[PDB]
């Protein structure tokens, strides 16, 4: 598994401790590391009290499949991590939402998958755990102490979310035309009306690459060449103190704009570091997140940069005659 970006796994004591909303980007990254975002999501939506990711952190979150290309890169953000950063919103599951089969759902308290419309997360209540189907919450003494390890969290798909450059409607409609020409045998994906079909089969699991350029629905492709580029923008750097924890808003803004905070060489050319003396324990220091950059997809002729590029499991209704 990949490492923590900033902070190690949390050691929680009081299950009713309030979760604050710290403005710093590095502080948000540290919260993401400790699975504070999933705990806050469960509190807000599923009437859950306590914390997940106890003593394990984000490193050992379960994935489906276990072998995930983007999991080994720590800096790559999952849909939940993107939710905590304000990029997207993970909705609470409704009755119509579909739970994909295949993952081991026994004991899980939270699991999210990227649907054809948006992102849906399922959560179980306090003192309860999902059953093997993933459709039910049942009583469990294991999830009773109020502190749960990271093996209770499941993330579905090989997802990677990132800053998005907006694209106009004409490009999106061309991409949709390419997708519908490339997938003529699909009629519904997660209940969202795909190309017209007079005959619907039973829903089936479907593993397919997709992008979230950002519109009414996602774009799924079969052939594509994805390139990775490093821009070393301000989003690629996380600034932290010596050993205590992430820096605050003021220190982060000072180091990232004034350019008087020492760090590594990449940050030195990107922004500018402090040199000369070395006793700068109070001063923050900034490094680059362990990600291969941002994905640029070359699909359907003209190439776009998506918001989220992934390889997940969805539900499809194939055409019958």
């Amino acid at each position: 598994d990949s490492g923590p970006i900033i902070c190690a796994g949390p050691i929680h004591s009081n299950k009713s401790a309030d979760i604050p909303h710290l403005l710093g980007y590095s502080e948000k990254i540290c919260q993401i590391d400790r699975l504070i975002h999933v705990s806050s999501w469960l509190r807000n939506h599923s009437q859950f009290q306590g914390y997940v990711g106890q003593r394990g952190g984000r490193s050992q979150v379960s994935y489906y499949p276990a072998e995930n290309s983007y999991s080994r890169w720590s800096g790559l953000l999952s849909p939940c991590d993107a939710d905590w950063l304000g990029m997207l919103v993970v909705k609470k599951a409704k009755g119509s939402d579909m739970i994909v089969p295949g993952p081991s759902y026994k004991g899980k308290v939270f699991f999210e998958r990227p649907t054809f419309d948006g992102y849906v997360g399922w959560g179980c209540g306090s003192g309860k755990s999902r059953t093997e189907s993933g459709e039910l919450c049942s009583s469990d003494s294991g999830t009773s102490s109020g502190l749960l390890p990271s093996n209770r969290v499941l993330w579905i798909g090989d997802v990677a979310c990132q800053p998005m450059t907006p694209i106009p409607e004409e490009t999106f409609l061309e991409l949709k035309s390419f997708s519908q020409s490339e997938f003529p045998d699909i009629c519904k994906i997660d209940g969202i009306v795909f190309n017209q079909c007079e005959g619907e089969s039973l829903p089936q699991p479907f593993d397919v690459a997709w992008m979230d350029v950002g519109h009414s629905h996602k774009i799924i492709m079969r052939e594509h060449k994805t390139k990775w580029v490093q821009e070393s923008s301000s989003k690629d750097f996380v600034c932290y103190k010596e050993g205590t924890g992430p820096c605050s808003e003021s220190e982060e803004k000072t180091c990232k704009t004034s350019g008087s905070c020492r760090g590594d060489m990449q940050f030195c050319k990107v922004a500018g570091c402090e040199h000369g003396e070395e006793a700068s324990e109070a001063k923050c220091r900034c490094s680059l997140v362990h990600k291969p950059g941002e994905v640029v997809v070359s699909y359907g002729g003209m190439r776009v940069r998506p918001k989220c590029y992934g390889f997940s499991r969805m539900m499809a209704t194939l055409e019958v005659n």
Epitope: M98, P101, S133, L202
Partner: nanobody, 115 residues
Framework: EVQLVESGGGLVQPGGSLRLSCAAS????????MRWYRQAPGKERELVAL?????????EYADSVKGRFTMFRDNARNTVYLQMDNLKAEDTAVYYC???????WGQGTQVTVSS
């Protein structure tokens, strides 16, 4: 086309026993996961019993009805049943037949448990 009929409801004293039925037309339950639903008056719906044909045909019940509800299916008559035992007054509701991952739903039957 797909139509699910719902039948088998009625009045019964607490501690009684009754069996529902749900015929499936246009598709086979042998390869489709099925769920049983119920909506008590004045409140929303929730799962009751699932027969996951995609998980080896294992039955599964909610904690509120576990130990009192039995669900099984036979493919010969293309019908799915829900045997109910030790019914309490809390179980008075309308029960639905629903195919997993799709909007095909049943018309619903009333099961009333009272003295």
């Amino acid at each position: 086309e797909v139509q699910l009929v719902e039948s088998g409801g009625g009045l019964v004293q607490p501690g009684g026993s009754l069996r529902l039925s749900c015929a499936a037309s246009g598709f086979t339950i042998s390869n489709a996961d099925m769920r049983w639903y119920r909506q008590a008056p004045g409140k929303e719906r929730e799962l009751v019993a699932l027969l996951l044909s995609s998980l080896g045909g294992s039955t599964e019940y909610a904690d509120s009805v576990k130990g009192r509800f039995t669900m099984f299916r036979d493919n010969a008559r293309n019908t799915v049943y829900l045997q109910m035992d030790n019914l309490k007054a809390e179980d008075t509701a309308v029960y639905y037949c629903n195919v997993r991952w799709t909007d095909y739903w049943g018309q619903g039957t009333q099961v009333t448990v009272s003295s």
